[model samples]
Target: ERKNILIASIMTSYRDLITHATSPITSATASPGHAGYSSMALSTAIHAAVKYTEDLLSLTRTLREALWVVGPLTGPGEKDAQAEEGMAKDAEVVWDVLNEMRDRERERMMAA
Candidate 1:
């Protein structure tokens, strides 16, 4: 009821923030400008936007899993075992993806 509504609202807000932050880079990249500067800035912005979005999604998923595990909604004597395990796995996967992205970004930075 109230808890579910709260979760939905929070997710919506997170989504809106991600969208707002990424929109500018998309619009900027589409415009004509100094090719070198625009390419570099746009590439950096896009990489950042993807990373940020992945982080937000990972955080939200983790939080939702935590809530399911701890909340009264799960009922007595019955825990969401599968969801708990899934979240643990998801956390690892998300972390690995982000780390790989970071490594690539670092290489790009070094090369520049």
Candidate 2:
């Protein structure tokens, strides 16, 4: 149950992260002044998104490590090994996605 809860939380956080990532960073306005303000606010949002990227990835890495070591030492059987492998794979997939997103966003920020 504890492992299930952790996995669920990771999924929820990933959804939230996607929401932040897909948020519009630009909008049209009739006045240049308003456009400036929009860019400023959007930049701040992007900054925050980058921070969350690091945070979630770090948590995932830690949780993934803990998951592997939580099981029994010997005679646990084959089923437990399969389950652990699946959980670690899930974490790895999420970490990869986050790492790519962070790289993409940082590149865009630099280009801007």
Candidate 3:
């Protein structure tokens, strides 16, 4: 049940990022550049998206593994301190990168 919830949340987050956040640079009024420019832009976006998705998936996997590996050793009140800290840091980094990506896309759209 928890795994399902985590997967659902990650999928929702990814959907929001790709659908609501990342802007399409191929609109009619967008600037024309060499084929390389569009290719590079798309490649970069894909790379970033893949990285973002990987992080979310990794976190989910980590949590599930924690539930398996440490579940028997710890009481309900107990927590994996290292995993908790790592998750917090990862969340901050992901949020920063997503904001940066969104800003860049907005700037590009405005410039177009």
Candidate 4:
């Protein structure tokens, strides 16, 4: 219960930080507290910004909207299978998807 509460609070703060920023809502702005900056926040923000969609029925605009957004031997979900292999694995997955999409589009255009 305590861990869940902490995670929920953190996610709320980050989403609010993104929504309430007076300046550019960059990754640096998403971090909690008055720190100078956090690269992790930047990376996570980029990860989320790319994935957010207007049609998505989510209060949170991030991937799975989970607080555990860091990768590879770090963050809350680090122990999971996805993170065990590192960022390269995630990048590979994205690359594969893009290639598949390109291939499908090419096929459709060729047929047309």
Candidate 1: the clashing residue pairs are none
lDDT value, residue 106 of candidate 4: 77
Could you tell me which 10 consecutive residues in candidate 2 have the lowest summed lDDT? 21-30
lDDT of 1 by residue, 1-112 (tens): 6346556656765565566554344554354665555566556655654545544655676555544554455446546777799889988898889988898767553455
**Candidate 4: which pairs clash?**
none
How high is the lDDT of residue 43 in model 2?
Answer: 76
Which pairs in model 2 have colliding backbones?
none
- For every candidate in turn, the CA RMSD to the true structure comes to 33.4, 34.2, 36.4, 30.3
Error of 1 at 105 (Å): 1.5
Give the runs in model 1 whose Cα sits over 4 Å from its true position. 1-79, 108-112
Tell me each candidate's TM-score: 0.25, 0.31, 0.28, 0.22
Candidate 3 accuracy as TM-score: 0.28
Ranking, TM-score, top scorer first:
2, 3, 1, 4
Best-fitting candidate, scored by TM-score: 2
lDDT of 3: 0.64
TM-score of candidate 2 versus the correct structure, residues matched by position: 0.31
lDDT digits (tens) for residues 19-75 of candidate 2: 654445444545667665556655776565464554556567655664566576666
Per-residue alpha-carbon lDDT of candidate 3 for residues 1-112, written as tens digits (9 for 90 to 100): 7456666667776675586333454455646665556576666666655746655666766665544553455447546767899889988998889988898667553455
Candidate 4 lDDT over residue span 1-112, tens digit each: 6235445555665575576343344456345753544445655665655543532333354446456655667357546666667776877799889988898667553455
Show model 2 residue runs off by greater than 4 Å.
Answer: 1-29, 52-112
Off by over 4 Å in 4: 1-84, 108-112
Reference-based lDDT, residue 86, model 1:
86
Please count the clashing residue pairs in each candidate, in the order shown: 0, 0, 0, 0
